[PDB]
Design an enzyme around this catalytic site. Structure first.
Site, PDB file in Angstrom:
ATOM      1  N   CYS A 125     -25.291  79.178 -37.133  1.00 27.69           N
ATOM      2  CA  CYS A 125     -25.001  79.503 -35.737  1.00 27.69           C
ATOM      3  C   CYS A 125     -24.825  81.007 -35.470  1.00 27.69           C
ATOM      4  O   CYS A 125     -25.266  81.519 -34.445  1.00 27.69           O
ATOM      5  CB  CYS A 125     -23.739  78.806 -35.266  1.00 27.69           C
ATOM      6  SG  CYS A 125     -23.990  77.043 -35.004  1.00 27.69           S
ATOM      7  N   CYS A 131     -19.512  97.489 -58.784  1.00 28.16           N
ATOM      8  CA  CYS A 131     -19.057  96.132 -58.515  1.00 28.16           C
ATOM      9  C   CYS A 131     -18.226  96.161 -57.235  1.00 28.16           C
ATOM     10  O   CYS A 131     -17.780  97.226 -56.822  1.00 28.16           O
ATOM     11  CB  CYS A 131     -18.199  95.612 -59.670  1.00 28.16           C
ATOM     12  SG  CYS A 131     -16.806  96.704 -60.096  1.00 28.16           S
TER      13      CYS A 131
HETATM   14 ZN   LIG Z   1     -25.534  76.094 -36.432  1.00 24.90          ZN
END
Ligand SMILES: [Zn+2]
Ligand SMILES: Nc1ncnc2c1ncn2[C@@H]1O[C@H](COP(=O)(O)OP(=O)(O)OP(=O)(O)O)[C@@H](O)[C@H]1O
Ligand SMILES: Nc1ncnc2c1ncn2[C@@H]1O[C@H](COP(=O)(O)OP(=O)(O)OP(=O)(O)O)[C@@H](O)[C@H]1O
Ligand SMILES: [Mg+2]
Ligand SMILES: [Mg+2]
Ligand SMILES: [Mg+2]
Ligand SMILES: [Mg+2]
Ligand SMILES: [Zn+2]
Lengths: 301, 78, 302, 78
Positions: free
Chosen positions: A194, A215
């Site tokens: 989304c 790192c």
């Molecule tokens: Zn979604």
């Protein structure tokens, strides 16, 4: 078929590891604590956050944990909690299973020493989410994502959107001083697709961001906080007490902990998310205080 | 040509500071996200964007289309 | 297995336990991380919060820990982190020292298996706060109170007001779902006696509240959060980064984390607190834009 | 004779709810603290009290003296 469910005791004695947990009834926080034994949780990534998460759930007396990680314990991981130097070179899941079974032999474990994103593994992973619950053939109650890369997050996302599986995701920043948790109920709250982060949206290989000989920073403090809030959210969700958070951040620099609620994108790139949104919208459309001692006649305006 | 404006709030700071950005409408929103992140000194690559009401936005679209679908009030999730 | 390390190294290799910590320099969060090795911290109470606190500080590479607890590990403690079932019956400080030395052999430990509140022990306790620092004869940099009763808190309070010793206090509620940390700089912020809880104020023996065969509820989640925020505050304080909190609460039910600042009571019951306030107020009155590498789309900030 | 009023805010609730208490001035403040705690359903024994500005109060004094030193606006720390 049934699974047997053993009896967690309230007895307040030194030898009872559940005494301080069952006291949550007496203290009126959780009326049915023992229900924790009936749930199975899958954890992907048994690193900084995931290892502590697994321990906290083990100590709570969760019915079953499923652990997924393909990595080995290294001394460079010793800045974080859980693993000990003597475990260096072992697989994270084998090390974890051994320690955790010692901690609480009541908990069932199923561990998988593989990378969940590959063609060979992905379908097994989904099979285990769907069938790896406390009773074989039933799904796990929750998946927890404690991984450190978007590819693995997207993989869990894809799987859960397809299965309609509720999951929670956790992350910690590269600078060690922020983190978050998020609850994803496919169709009801935003999935990872989304609202993708910049790198996913721009189709950049996240590998290209990694310079050799550098790192991410990490702190045992941040891991502890993030795991703690993650598992607290898990308990609130599974045992129905308090307010479940849909998103809870942690900013260590200024001790800011924002809550939010992420809503689904109706044009989400993941078709299963869209389908889940459709199913969800359809299903939607269908005291007085006692004072034992008040001898001084104090009164409330 | 035509420009769109966004008010982007940083959700991870207790002061909830915002930046107002003027954007040529054909600019891919990914470049706006990047610009906003740089302004707030948070890593561009890992930032996401949602609407004021919490709807997820995919930023692989023009500024113009983001504006049309969602308005000018947005929130960056670093 | 781990070997001792003389100089803390930034080298990003699998065998370097400080690599992900020293990365905090490169990332510009803490400019002088290695300074952690120069500090000593005393922890009173190595239970739910205190054990995790000790582990987090050990993993960070603190120079020295002093542990005080008189209790033994029990299986009833297995709902909390750190201790393992095979350690049941051992003293918390002995069990902790053994595990912690395995975790990081660079850290010095001094442990004391006694009750700090008794007449016999109190003086030793103060001696150790004053002289038990990284160099013998220097004080510890911080005392952390991770105890579960007011008597022990008041004891640490009294000692620290007397010595002018900065300390941090932590607590978790009996219902397991709330906790807090607090920074006490005697004279500058409220001491525990500046604003005593009801039981202390009403001079009630807290023992009288305790019914046998009932225990406080506790959760490993809350312990982890509280220890995490406590040690975060410790790092911020010792290594001078971010904003140190003077009080930070945690309410798990609603995910509320209030910050506050507790100010000294000018008529505080503890005379040393009052004295410290006086010294502090005197010492106070005597004291003296963004660059974008890539902007090819002509985005501009209004 | 005289009564004093206190507005006590619960610092542990995000809503920051308050209770206004009317107290006979000779009442030991410890009894007020207890009453407030009971009202907010937080344990009396472990609760402390500070001023709106964060100054620690010792509640082993009369309501009247608390009022005179600190005013009516207080915060309970459970
Ligand atoms: Zn979604
Ligand atoms: N596709 C994947 N399948 C299974 N586990 C994964 C996957 N991707 C990441 N993980 C696991 O997530 C874990 C948690 O990350 P964490 O950063 O704490 O470990 P790390 O990478 O070993 O540490 P560091 O980043 O300091 O090297 C790692 O153990 C990693 O192996
Ligand atoms: N006066 C004291 N001196 C030294 N240590 C103390 C003192 N008072 C309390 N402590 C320590 O504080 C610790 C933290 O309390 P915690 O509640 O986690 O342990 P516990 O009391 O064993 O657990 P439970 O309350 O479930 O029985 C205990 O180990 C306790 O012994
Ligand atoms: Mg690794
Ligand atoms: Mg990693
Ligand atoms: Mg005990
Ligand atoms: Mg206790
Ligand atoms: Zn004081």
């Amino acid at each position: 078929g049934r699974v047997r469910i053993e009896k967690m005791s309230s007895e307040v004695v030194d030898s009872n590891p559940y005494s301080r947990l069952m006291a949550l009834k007496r203290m009126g926080i959780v009326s049915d604590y023992e229900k924790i034994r009936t749930f199975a949780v899958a954890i992907v990534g048994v690193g900084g956050v995931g290892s502590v998460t697994a321990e906290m759930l083990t100590r709570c007396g969760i019915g079953k944990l499923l652990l997924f990680d393909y990595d080995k314990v290294e001394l460079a991981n010793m800045n974080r909690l859980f693993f000990q130097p003597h475990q260096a070179g072992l697989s994270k899941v084998q090390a974890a299973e051994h320690t955790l079974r010692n901690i609480n032999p009541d908990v069932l474990f199923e561990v998988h020493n593989y990378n969940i994103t590959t063609v060979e593994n992905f379908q097994h992973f989904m099979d285990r989410i769907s069938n790896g619950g406390l009773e074989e053939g039933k799904p796990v109650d929750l998946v927890l994502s404690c991984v450190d890369n978007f590819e693995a997050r997207m993989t869990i996302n894809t799987a859960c959107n397809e299965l309609g599986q509720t999951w929670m995701e956790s992350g910690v920043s590269e600078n060690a001083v922020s983190g978050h948790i998020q609850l994803i109920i496919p169709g009801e709250s935003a999935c990872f697709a989304c609202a993708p982060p910049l790198v996913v949206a721009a189709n950049i290989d996240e590998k290209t961001l990694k310079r050799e000989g550098v790192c991410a920073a990490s702190l045992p403090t941040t891991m502890g906080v993030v795991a703690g809030i993650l598992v607290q959210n898990v308990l609130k969700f599974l045992l129905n007490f308090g307010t479940v958070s849909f998103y809870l951040g942690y900013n260590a620099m200024q001790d800011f902990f924002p809550t939010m609620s992420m809503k689904p994108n109706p044009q989400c790139d993941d078709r299963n998310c869209r389908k889940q949104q459709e199913e969800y919208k359809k299903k939607v459309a269908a005291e007085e205080i006692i004072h034992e001692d008040n001898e001084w006649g104090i009164e409330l305006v | 040509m035509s420009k769109v404006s966004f008010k982007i709030t940083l959700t991870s700071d207790p002061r909830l500071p915002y930046k107002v950005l003027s954007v040529p409408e054909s600019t891919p929103f990914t470049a706006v996200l990047k610009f906003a992140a740089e302004e707030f000194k948070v890593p561009a690559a890992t930032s996401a964007i949602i609407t004021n009401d919490g709807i997820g936005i995919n930023p692989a679209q023009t500024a113009g289309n983001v504006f049309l679908k969602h308005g000018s009030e947005l929130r960056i999730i670093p």
